[PDB]
Design a binder for this molecule. Sequence first.
Ligand SMILES: CCCCCCCC/C=C\CCCCCCCC(=O)OC[C@H](COP(=O)(O)OCC[N+](C)(C)C)OC(=O)CCCCCCC/C=C/CCCCCCCC
Ligand SMILES: Cc1nc2c(OCc3ccccc3)cccn2c1CC#N
Ligand SMILES: *[C@@H]1O[C@H](CO)[C@@H](O)[C@H](O)[C@H]1NC(C)=O
Ligand SMILES: *[C@@H]1O[C@H](CO)[C@@H](O)[C@H](O)[C@H]1NC(C)=O
Ligand SMILES: *[C@@H]1O[C@H](CO)[C@@H](O)[C@H](O)[C@H]1NC(C)=O
Ligand SMILES: [Rb+]
Ligand SMILES: [Rb+]
Ligand SMILES: [Rb+]
Lengths: 987, 261
Amino acid sequence: EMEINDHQLSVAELEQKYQTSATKGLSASLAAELLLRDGPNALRPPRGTPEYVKFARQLAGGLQCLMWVAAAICLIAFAIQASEGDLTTDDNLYLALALIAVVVVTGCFGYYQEFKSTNIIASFKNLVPQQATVIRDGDKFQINADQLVVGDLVEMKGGDRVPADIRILQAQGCKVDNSSLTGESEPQTRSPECTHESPLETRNIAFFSTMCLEGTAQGLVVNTGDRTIIGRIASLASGVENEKTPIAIEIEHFVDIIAGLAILFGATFFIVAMCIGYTFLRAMVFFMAIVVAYVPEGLLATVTVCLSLTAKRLASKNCVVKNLEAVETLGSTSVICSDKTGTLTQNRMTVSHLWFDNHIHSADTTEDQSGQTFDQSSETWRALCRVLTLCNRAAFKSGQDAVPVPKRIVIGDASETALLKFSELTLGNAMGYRERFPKVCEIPFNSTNKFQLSIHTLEDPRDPRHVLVMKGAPERVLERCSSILIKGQELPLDEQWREAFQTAYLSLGGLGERVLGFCQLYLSEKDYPPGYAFDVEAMNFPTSGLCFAGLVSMIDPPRATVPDAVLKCRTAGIRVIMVTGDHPITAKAIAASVGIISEGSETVEDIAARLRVPVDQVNRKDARACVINGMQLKDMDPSELVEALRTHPEMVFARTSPQQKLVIVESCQRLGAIVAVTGDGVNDSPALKKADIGVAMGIAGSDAAKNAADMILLDDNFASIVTGVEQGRLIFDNLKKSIAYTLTKNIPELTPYLIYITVSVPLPLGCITILFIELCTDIFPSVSLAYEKAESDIMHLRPRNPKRDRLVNEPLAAYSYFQIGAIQSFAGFTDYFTAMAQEGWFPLLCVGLRPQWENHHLQDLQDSYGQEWTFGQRLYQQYTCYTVFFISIEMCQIADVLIRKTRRLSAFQQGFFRNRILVIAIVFQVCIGCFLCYCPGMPNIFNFMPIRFQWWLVPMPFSLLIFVYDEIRKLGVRCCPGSWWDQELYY
Amino acid sequence: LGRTLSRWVWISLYYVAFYVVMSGIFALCIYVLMRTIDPYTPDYQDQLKSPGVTLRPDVYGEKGLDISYNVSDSTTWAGLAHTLHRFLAGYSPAAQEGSINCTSEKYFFQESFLAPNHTKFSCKFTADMLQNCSGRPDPTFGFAEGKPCFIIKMNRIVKFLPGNSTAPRVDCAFLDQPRDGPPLQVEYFPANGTYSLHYFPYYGKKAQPHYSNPLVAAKLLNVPRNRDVVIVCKILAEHVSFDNPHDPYEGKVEFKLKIQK
Ligand SMILES: CCCCCCCC/C=C\CCCCCCCC(=O)OC[C@H](COP(=O)(O)OCC[N+](C)(C)C)OC(=O)CCCCCCC/C=C/CCCCCCCC
Ligand SMILES: Cc1nc2c(OCc3ccccc3)cccn2c1CC#N
Ligand SMILES: *[C@@H]1O[C@H](CO)[C@@H](O)[C@H](O)[C@H]1NC(C)=O
Ligand SMILES: *[C@@H]1O[C@H](CO)[C@@H](O)[C@H](O)[C@H]1NC(C)=O
Ligand SMILES: *[C@@H]1O[C@H](CO)[C@@H](O)[C@H](O)[C@H]1NC(C)=O
Ligand SMILES: [Rb+]
Ligand SMILES: [Rb+]
Ligand SMILES: [Rb+]
């Protein structure tokens, strides 16, 4: 756009273009205008969130589309009836009002929940305005970063956030932290001369989001707001559209099952309805009533409160999910594409290794100091500790005595900050300690002197001499030492010790670490007496023949909980890929440190290096590992990427642009994988959005990433991902337990109508009462099944196969609808005839009685004993058939919630009282069940009446036949895991 | 199309076995079901704490019984008379042969079953007992005149008993219009509006296959022409309720009557 030549322009062309001064800057007027012209130097947020379209989007979705259609069909049927004078159409109204109501109320839930997520995430953001030091009219002063305009001369020092895209005009040791744009963990030199043609890789551009680690620089704002590199990345990630979630896909597929069955039951019973002499009008109103009865008014409620309970579990471990669907995704996930810098790692230069006493020590690099420290006993250590604690000018910001030492803000270079935290963690109170050793000379890090030196007087009065302490690049330190501390002494620095030093030096550099040497000399009190006047420029103290102390070396290390998390994920069969923009050496090193790449696994370059063979001749199948870098990832045909992806199962993508992370996620999704990405920087925001679930670091993470993500790790604890998996596999397994328990009772609601059509017996079951079942009595039972523990070892299972393994499928549908539902039906009708006969209507009289039954003009119909009943009296008797079919349903659901506890284990094995909440729910079920009957007046409120306690008992045999029949089912499942029986009677 | 051809039949047959087993269990349950209950008495009869009274001729316009007609125009009352006639076609002596001449004049209790093939004895109620409303001499049942005969009948409830004090008698009257007109006056048949108590109790359609409810006939002599009136017939008796608001036919009948000239 503009920058691809901005860094390349001469200063003359730059101030010409931007109408500015490379030394004095924008006039005050001009800059003010420019700000009006261009808007604030800030990234535009999404423009519109009308609180009402949040709600309007909450009212869509597979179930909700179904409920809506079913409401319409209710009302169209109400028209068709009222037009031809059919009474008690009020059942149609209720049904629709209920349906709509349920989806609306769920809706409010789903909306307010999302509200309560987005506030907590927003609770964590830092809303104090970032600042810039700008020079305008030759005046250096402080403005808010967003009042910067294109062309401003700005200035940066250590500690500053780069406030815009700045073309670097001058720099003294400017090193910068691009970990957010690139993946680059190592500090990056900024300097005025054009290093590249791509501004992403040129050195004379500092990037609007990033941090200046050290040094100083001055330069011209070349881009602001969404025109920055950062703004273009967040654009790219806005235009990314995220796919449908796995749980939604599952719900839609089973709404397709329910649709199929309701359509065909309607069809066949409408055809039937004509062939028994019904008006086309009323066979169509039956068709409608049937497809509506296949719709479970309450399942949306139960599914969302199930999901919401898992969201509560995850919140309470600092895992905050934006929408409830996302609660599940990590369960179905099978690939994890992960960021390295700041995601796997800490992005925090940490002291990792030391070389002293002829040995390589290794520091605890974890952030909670849960690792294992190095040997601090020796004299050589405390000497090195002294040189590194005294030869350092960094310092902690104040008021930080409670915040952990790795998390403390500091004023100092990258190296020096690292070492200060190292001294503070090892020696304790470093700043105090080094105050006790008054500094009386100092050479700061100098490009002509190439080291940093400082001379000090000592602590106790009895020792009057000075100690010169020095730190620098290892070779440069060694070329000024003549001596070395070893194991309690100070040895000549002979060729043995230099070969030993150089092996330790390159050994530690090979890990890709930043190593510095450290040396010292105690100056005489004869030649340097108390008060001696040390002059730098005429170097009147020694700077050779020093006493070498040790090497300390540093790296960006993995987060404490990360490697165990990666291993737990892999033993759950989750392929874990590393997508990082960092360089491939670092990429691989961390990949091994964490478990992406296993012990003894080699890349093809490792096989070639081991056998000493041209890489061409190596068999690529012999390499578990692979590290493909981002500028050969272009040259790869999508099928070269699928081949590489499934030839080496331990994959490492290095130097990968944000787009390329989107490519990898997409390429894995095309192969049917449910892929999740974990990330912090803005370079992850695109990938994070495309992924089936995006997981952003709460604290490390950029705003664009936190925005792309579906899930936020508020404490930046990677191991929450492995709890995410576990909970995710739970509700899945538990949702099909709850779904099934609510779908079966649908068949003993439909069939009494079916019979009532074909046989014309008085109405067995009214709509008011099946609303009470579905939307009230059986609800708690259905959501209590969300508290079921695993039955197998969930976390050693492979990812669910999205094609075969599904939420509800043909086995579960068939078995639940047409077998347990059947048994429930028979229990209903049995209790129907019994109540009728006991009150006077014999079963054979019941055949074809409906016309006379409902006939408001017969107020003297005769029963089997020839008793003449008014219309109201027959009506109360019908309400009794409602209540009797209802309590039949209930009792068989007390059978059904317990039977659905387990899908393969026996209830005697694990328990009836395992699930305290489910027992609670059943107590609640029979409580409200009894309230519906025996409350004074119920006949005239809802259609329930106090059924004689005989009729309670009549179904309990069928209930227990359900218990026993399903127990033998889930007894043969585990007993004879063969072919024939499990395909049919396992769900 | 989906599953295997060789096992489609196998679990096809499994479902068959499932339904036949379950069906069987239902069958046995309803066999026991019917073996449980007495053939002559209802086990509980819970909605029948009080009887409903029905009325003839029953003509509902909307909202209930609405009997309108014009005395000068035979075609508005011919079908009313005809539904009276074919209602009483089973109160004729020829049809009502299988019953006894009740003169007990108090509750007739049968403990032992004495009648062909073990049935019990019913009373007589022949048309002529309604007298002026029997179809003779008048086959228009007082309609042509303007004093129509409505036939009030109580629903039958096995072993139900309505009182001791007197016979249960019906009482029809306006819904009070006291300032703007006299009160209703009716002649009932048999007299005083009484169903003799030997007509209770009912022992069931198996115990008395040839049974017939007692009638009374209200003959409305007072009612004004070309004016809507609402008329209520209550049953006066101790063991009967006539103001159950959730059933307007329990013990009482209302109807709207309009007699045009
Ligand atoms: C897709 C597959 C569908 C399969 C459905 C199969 C259902 C068929 C099951 C049973 C039908 C009845 C079997 C009848 C034979 C058994 C014995 C029997 O004959 O018993 C006796 C009664 C009558 O005795 P009585 O008066 O002569 O005794 C005298 C009375 N005393 C004793 C007081 C003097 O016989 C009677 O009433 C006869 C009249 C029976 C009333 C018809 C029942 C209609 C109800 C149908 C609903 C079925 C449930 C559907 C649920 C499907 C779920 C998938
Ligand atoms: C399953 C069922 N459906 C009804 C019903 O349909 C109403 C309707 C009509 C048209 C469209 C939608 C609904 C009315 C009454 C009872 N019903 C029962 C229960 C049995 N008994
Ligand atoms: C009325 O009772 C008398 C008693 O003698 C009897 O003869 C007569 O048959 C009864 N009525 C009829 C119509 O049978
Ligand atoms: C009934 O008919 C008789 C003649 O059989 C007559 O005397 C009597 O007045 C009539 N009653 C009424 C109310 O018309
Ligand atoms: C009653 O019927 C006669 C004959 O049809 C008619 O002439 C007369 O006007 C009618 N009266 C009323 C009030 O309808
Ligand atoms: Rb339903
Ligand atoms: Rb160690
Ligand atoms: Rb996403």
